[PDB]
């Protein structure tokens, strides 16, 4: 020190530095603490977890993406696993709990190799080569189901739906949830069975009633009621009609005024009397343009003054007020209408068409909500979920949201796999076989990747109260005797370990990302040497 203060960087004593074996041990144990949390919620026998927010709100979910999102952490290694499950939920939306267990399994087998004197880059180089060997092996085992017609194609969508609906709360209704999740894509999809638009399906939750009241409604569900509720709640079309002629207007009902600030100077009583007649002539002209166009229900973004309450009541024209701008886009898609910017551009061709417009009483008081139905297949499908608890209505949203993420992935052509742990076991033995041929320094690298894939089937046996040793030994001996890869772990205990008879189906694009996200993340973690963490 020589007697003078030596400071290279500001906040010297605040920041700490980790290096050597102690820096690697702290990174592996940070992932083991996150793994043991996720391993308990993995599989249909898993358990949810309570998430307490600083504001007092609680969240109960088993989703690794939602648990880690609201989780307040300290160590940055555990924070890297937060965005790992977030990467799985944002794109694919399925298997967020599997990427955390598989990534920590790669780090657990890597810690044993580091203690043996293997350079960390040599460990990462072995996982990258072993990742492509597992994907190429599973790609050859699966078959293309696109040869079937649309009748059988709906069955494969029901197969993968019931799989993603498990492991989450309110899993007893999955039979009806699987039917409603597939019919949403049947109505909204391209004729070529490609590149379906997910944004056309909206998730609208409602708190009340019971879960048995959840049903599909094609249309728009708004939180605003009819203005001046002297009109009938349920609107009915005319005897003969082309439709209801729904009208959408982003302009409130007011006498025309310049957008710029204006000054209207009245210098005489005669000029003031003309403003009186000019005022009432505009409200009379605006209500006549809607009647001449045949429209019935009028939608206003900014609402309208109380002058038009009785004016629209004489002509029997329903009206709503204070509709959000984002909801206006949702309205024009369902009824196939066009937003009319002003009465001068109002025409009968820009009016939307829906089957019926009505409101429901829901509970005792609550609030008034508007419901729109369609008379045929349209591009808008709105999900309707009910529940007796605020936590159930919440989790059921993301439960069906992740279920829709599995169906939209099946829209991609020629990608299917069977779940239940049958995919990880098939890809595990293919990597261990290459280790005997390659040998060399990387022989131990393929062994660590093969033992990491078997952790997912062994984790399923823990939540089901089975023996992970006896279960894994049966799966490994089955793949060696016969080439059938469809044998896997059964957590429901229905027998028939063949996935073909149990109908369990998963997307291949979901399982392919689990290996890529786990392998590529561990490659960056093993490269970390000096850890500088500043004090909060």
């Amino acid at each position: 020190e020589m007697g003078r203060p030596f400071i290279i960087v500001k906040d010297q004593g605040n920041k700490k530095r980790q290096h050597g074996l102690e820096a690697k041990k702290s990174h592996i144990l940070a992932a083991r603490s996150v793994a043991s949390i996720i391993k308990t919620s993995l599989g249909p026998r898993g358990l949810d977890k309570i998430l307490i927010s600083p504001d007092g709100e609680i969240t109960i979910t088993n989703d690794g993406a939602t648990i880690l999102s609201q989780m307040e952490l300290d160590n940055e290694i555990a924070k890297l696993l937060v965005q790992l499950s977030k990467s799985q939920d944002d794109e694919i939306g399925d298997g967020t709990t599997g990427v955390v267990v598989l990534a920590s399994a790669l780090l657990d087998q890597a810690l044993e190799l580091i203690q043996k004197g293997i350079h960390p880059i040599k460990i990462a180089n072995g996982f990258d080569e072993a990742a492509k060997l597992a994907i190429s092996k599973l790609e050859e085992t699966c078959d293309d189901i696109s040869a079937s017609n649309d009748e059988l194609f709906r069955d494969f969508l029901l197969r993968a739906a019931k799989t993603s609906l498990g492991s989450k709360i309110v899993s007893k209704d999955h039979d009806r949830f699987a039917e409603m999740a597939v019919e949403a894509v049947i109505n909204v999809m391209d004729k070529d069975r490609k590149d379906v638009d997910f944004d056309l399906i909206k998730m609208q939750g409602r708190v009340g009633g019971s879960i048995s009241d959840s049903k599909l409604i094609n249309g728009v569900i708004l939180d605003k009621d009819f203005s001046h509720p002297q009109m009938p709640k349920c609107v009915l079309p005319k005897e003969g009609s082309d439709g209801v002629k729904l009208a959408i207007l982003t302009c409130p009902f007011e006498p025309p005024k310049p957008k710029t600030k204006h000054k209207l100077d009245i210098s005489s009583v005669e000029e003031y009397q003309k403003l009186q007649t000019y005022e009432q002539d505009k409200f009379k002209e605006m209500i006549d343009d809607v009647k001449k166009a045949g429209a019935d229900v009028v939608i206003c973004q900014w609402g309208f003054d109380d002058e038009a309450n009785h004016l629209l009541l004489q002509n029997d024209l329903p009206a709503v007020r204070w509709v959000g701008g984002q909801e206006l886009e949702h309205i024009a898609i369902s009824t196939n209408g066009r937003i009319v910017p002003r009465f001068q551009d109002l025409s009968k061709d820009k009016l939307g068409t829906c089957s019926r417009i009505y409101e429901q009483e829901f509970g005792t008081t609550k609030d008034r909500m508007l419901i729109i139905e369609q008379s045929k297949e349209t591009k808008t499908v709105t999900c309707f979920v009910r529940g007796s608890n605020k936590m159930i209505v919440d989790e059921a949203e993301r439960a069906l949201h992740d279920s829709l993420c599995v169906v939209r992935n099946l829209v991609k052509d020629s990608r299917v796999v069977y779940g239940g742990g049958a995919a990880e076991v098939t890809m595990s033995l293919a990597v261990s076989e290459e280790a005997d041929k390659q040998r060399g320094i990387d022989q131990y690298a393929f062994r660590g990747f093969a033992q990491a894939l078997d952790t997912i089937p062994m984790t399923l046996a823990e939540n089901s109260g089975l023996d992970p040793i006896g279960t894994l030994s049966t799966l490994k001996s089955k793949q060696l005797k016969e080439k059938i890869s469809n044998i896997g772990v059964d957590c429901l205990g229905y027998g028939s370990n063949d996935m073909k008879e149990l109908f369990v189906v998963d997307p291949f694009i979901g399982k392919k990302q689990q290996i890529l996200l786990a392998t590529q993340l561990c490659r960056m973690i093993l490269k970390i040497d000096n850890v500088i963490i500043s004090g909060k």
């Binding site: 062994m458 046996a461 823990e462 089975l466 023996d467 992970p468 040793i469």
Partner: protein
């Protein structure tokens, strides 16, 4: 670095774990693992700690696989018993005294110790120390007969086996009459040399001024009569216990011993008598009446050599030659 300021550099894993205070309850159990290794075999305290931590790492993955902990514990006990018979067939018996097997095994057992470079003359040192005690019953070979004395200063190269018992403490030197002693009989005094006093409180009353003249003469006459019996037996070397209760030496007593050139060393540990009695072959004398020539031994040279500020008292040779001898080695080094 300990809490009291003492700094210990130790290769042995037992001292490393003992001097280090561990806050974890179970991690302190490894400290006593090296204790059992050092108490029985005495070697391998570092390996037994690593083998214990290695079995825990192998059994760590076995817990998540559905194996009961007692099954893991019963599996290691059955495997450890089988591992004993593995080493019984590979080991080879050796002769009672072999310079080839004992020296090569002693230098190898040092391994990373700082004395490995000094193991040239140190390997025969540890071998010849044990060969002095030989038995067919395979006794534990008590190390109390082998005394390693530490002296500050010098180099480790100067370490060598002493042909006789070495004394840690130096001479009184108050009288300092004899410079060097040759062909002397080493005595052992378990009593105290002083003017006569009971071991309990006493009173001496002087009723006449002529009585004090006899007191000063008779107090010196008692110390004089002790030197008479020592001179008749020709005992030139005396060793006295600490005797914290009663003064062991006196200015009048050391002056009487300076005329006869008798070297006396005091402040000797009480537990070291077994090393002094068996090594020098001298029976301790606890009474002036029991003092005789038969209890005294023989020593060729008793001297105190001051070398580079380090003073040490060494004895060369023992003419007793009793049933079993003792080992005496003086350790020197630059750093304490």
């Amino acid at each position: 670095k300990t809490s009291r300021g003492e700094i210990i550099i130790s290769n042995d894993g037992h001292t490393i774990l003992k001097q280090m205070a561990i806050l974890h309850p179970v991690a302190r159990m490894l400290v006593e693992v090296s204790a059992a290794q050092d108490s029985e075999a005495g070697d391998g305290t570092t390996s037994v700690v690593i083998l214990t931590g290695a079995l825990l790492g192998a059994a760590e993955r076995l817990l998540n696989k559905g194996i009961h902990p007692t099954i893991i514990a019963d599996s290691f006990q059955s495997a450890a018993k089988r591992s004993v018979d593995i080493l019984l067939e590979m080991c080879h018996k050796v002769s009672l005294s072999d310079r080839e097997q004992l020296v090569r095994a002693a230098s190898t057992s040092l391994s990373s110790k700082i004395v490995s470079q000094y193991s040239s003359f140190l390997a025969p040192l540890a071998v010849d120390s044990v060969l002095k005690i030989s038995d067919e019953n395979s006794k534990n070979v008590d190390l109390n007969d082998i005394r390693l004395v530490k002296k500050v200063g010098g180099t480790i190269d100067d370490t060598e086996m002493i042909d006789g018992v070495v004394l840690t403490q130096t001479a009184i030197k108050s009288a300092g009459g004899p410079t060097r002693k040759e062909k002397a009989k080493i005595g052992l005094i378990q009593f105290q040399i002083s003017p006569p006093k009971p071991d309990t409180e006493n009173n001496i009353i002087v009723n006449d001024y002529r009585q004090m003249d006899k007191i000063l003469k008779e107090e010196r006459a008692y110390l004089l009569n002790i030197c008479k019996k020592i001179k008749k037996a020709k005992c030139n070397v005396l060793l006295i216990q600490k005797s914290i209760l009663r003064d062991a030496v006196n200015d009048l007593a050391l002056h009487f011993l300076s005329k006869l050139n008798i070297m006396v060393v005091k402040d000797i540990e009480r537990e070291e008598i077994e090393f002094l009695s068996k090594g020098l072959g001298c029976k301790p004398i606890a009474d002036i009446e029991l003092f005789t020539e038969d209890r005294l031994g023989s020593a060729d040279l008793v001297e105190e050599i001051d070398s580079d500020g380090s003073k040490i008292v060494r004895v060369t040779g023992i003419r007793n030659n009793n049933a079993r001898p003792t080992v005496s080695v003086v350790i020197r080094g630059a750093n304490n």
